[PDB]
Amino acid sequence: SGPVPSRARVYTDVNTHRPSEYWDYESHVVEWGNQDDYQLVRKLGRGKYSEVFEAINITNNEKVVVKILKPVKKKKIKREIKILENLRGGPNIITLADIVKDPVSRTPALVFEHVNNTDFKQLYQTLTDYDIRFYMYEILKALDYCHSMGIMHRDVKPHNVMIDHEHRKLRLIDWGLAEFYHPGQEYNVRVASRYFKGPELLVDYQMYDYSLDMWSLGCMLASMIFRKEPFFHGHDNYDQLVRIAKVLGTEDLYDYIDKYNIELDPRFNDILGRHSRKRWERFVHSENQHLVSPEALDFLDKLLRYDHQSRLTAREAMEHPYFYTVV
């Protein structure tokens, strides 16, 4: 009979009702500018798909961020460009400012707005309960916006969240794995970083949606409020589901597999075992109790659910009592 189909509970048909120009990235015309307007300043980081640099726009002495793209399918570069162009100016979304190529190497490069990621290690003040609520709300604004625009980020994790704490500014970056949501489409499950992969990815359920980002956000919330990084510490993709099952329990996992008629990989036979569903209160310790509250655990419980359909949407999350105190 095969797996039972699924579709997003929200923003289901936003790409369906838009003209193809919006979501047909393969047909998008990229106009590559000239990289001489920029001087590279320093190396910011290295990724699987890119090298990120701090730079100066020499025409106006303004700091920019330059992402030089590593060898990848032309289709993937076009997808990222089109998504960034569609989301440009959205709340807490990194802003694409220019698309350039070095006249000699012809290597593709994306130019973005500068974001000054705070060195948190050099602050007397440690993370507070209010800080978590404030920045979790800013991420949600970004996710509700991109989901409303028919886009799944698919790589929500701390390294893809830039925070300028002095200006209380947050930006969701690296749209390289992002994809347009089309109801009924079967997606590649080899997305997201291991610790942040949703159970749908781990059981190879391809008909996933925006709710994938909500699981990733829940992993980030658990790691912050409990001071346990990462929260689900798998050593491989199969072991990752086992770490999740040791907290959410095996009974709800079998209800999830049964509901969607999911074919479970035989590699899971000898490793899943039997696990009770743990209370979230059991992760509270003297070192994290200032970040934990009944509201925070109720909110966490509503994100970290096997059933992608039963997770809060980004808009439902924004209305949770956990955020009543945020501006």
Ligand X SMILES: CCCOc1ccc(CN)cc1Cl
Binding site residue list for ATP: 44-52, 67
Rg of the chain's alpha carbons, rounded to an integer? 20
Backbone angles phi, psi at 23, to 5 degrees: -105, -10
Cα distance between residue 179 and residue 80, in whole Å: 8
Q: Considering only residues 62, 186, 229, 258, which one is a binding residue for ligand X as defined by CB under 6 A?
A: 258
Q: 233-268: b or e for each residue (b if 16 or more CB lie within 10 Å)?
A: ebeebebbbbbbbebbbbebbeebbeebebeeeeeb
Q: Which of residues 12-51 bind ligand X (CB under 6 A)?
A: 16
Q: Which of 13, 129, 155, 164 is catalytic?
A: 155
The residue among 233, 199, 239 whose CA lies nearest residue 216 is 199
109 vs 162 by CB, closer to ligand X: 162
Q: Which stretch binds ligand X (CB under 6 A): 27-35, 94-102, 231-239, 251-259?
A: 251-259
- Is the Cβ of residue 39 or residue 277 nearer to ligand X in the bound state? 277
Please say whether the beta carbons of 224 and 185 come within 8 A: no
For residue 298 the two structure tokens come to: 């109720």
Beta carbon of residue 294, minimum distance to ligand X (angstroms, whole number): 3
Before 5, cis peptide (omega within 30)?
A: no
- Residues 158-177 touching ligand X, rule: CB under 6 A, are 158-159, 161-163
Question: Which range touches ligand X (CB under 6 A), out of 55-63, 88-96, 126-134, 282-290?
Answer: 126-134
Question: How many residues lie near ligand X (CB under 6 A)?
Answer: 28
Which of 131, 204, 252, 307 binds ligand X (CB under 6 A)? It is 131
Least distance from C-beta 242 to ligand X, angstroms?
A: 10
Examine residue 224 and tell whether it contacts ligand X (CB under 6 A). yes
Best CA proximity match to 217, nearest among 137, 122, 101, 274: 137
Which x/- pattern, by CB under 6 A, does the window 283-322 give for ligand X? Answer: -----------xx--x----------------------x-
Closest CB to ligand X among residues 83, 132: 132
- Tell me whether residue 220 or residue 248 sits nearer to ligand X (CB atom): 220
Active site residue 155: yes
Cβ proximity to ligand X, 169 vs 315, nearer residue: 169
- Coil, strand or helix at 100: strand
Residue 196: other Cβ atoms inside 10 A: 28
**Distance (Å) of CA 304 to CA 33, 196, 283, 308:** 43, 11, 14, 9
Q: Does 94 bind ligand X (CB under 6 A)?
A: no
Instruction: In whole angstroms, give the CA distance from residue 27 to residue 45.
Output: 31
Nearer to ligand X, 239 or 295 (CB): 295
Q: How far is the CB of 269 from ligand X (least distance, A)?
A: 5
Tokens 């199969």 label which residue? 238
What DSSP letter does each residue of 152-205 carry, written as one string?
E----SGGGEEEEGGGTEEEE---TT-EE--TTPPPPS--S-GGG--HHHHTT-
Binding mask 183-222 for ligand X (x = CB under 6 A): --x----------------------------------x--
Binding mask 54-93 for ligand X (x = CB under 6 A): ----------------------------------------
Structure tokens belonging to residue 228? 């346990």
Q: Is the Cβ–Cβ distance between 128 and 150 less than 8 Å?
A: no
Q: Which residues bind ligand X (CB under 6 A)?
A: 16, 117, 120, 127, 131-132, 135, 158-159, 161-163, 182, 185, 220, 224, 254, 257-258, 264, 268-269, 272, 294-295, 298, 321, 324
Catalytic residues: 155
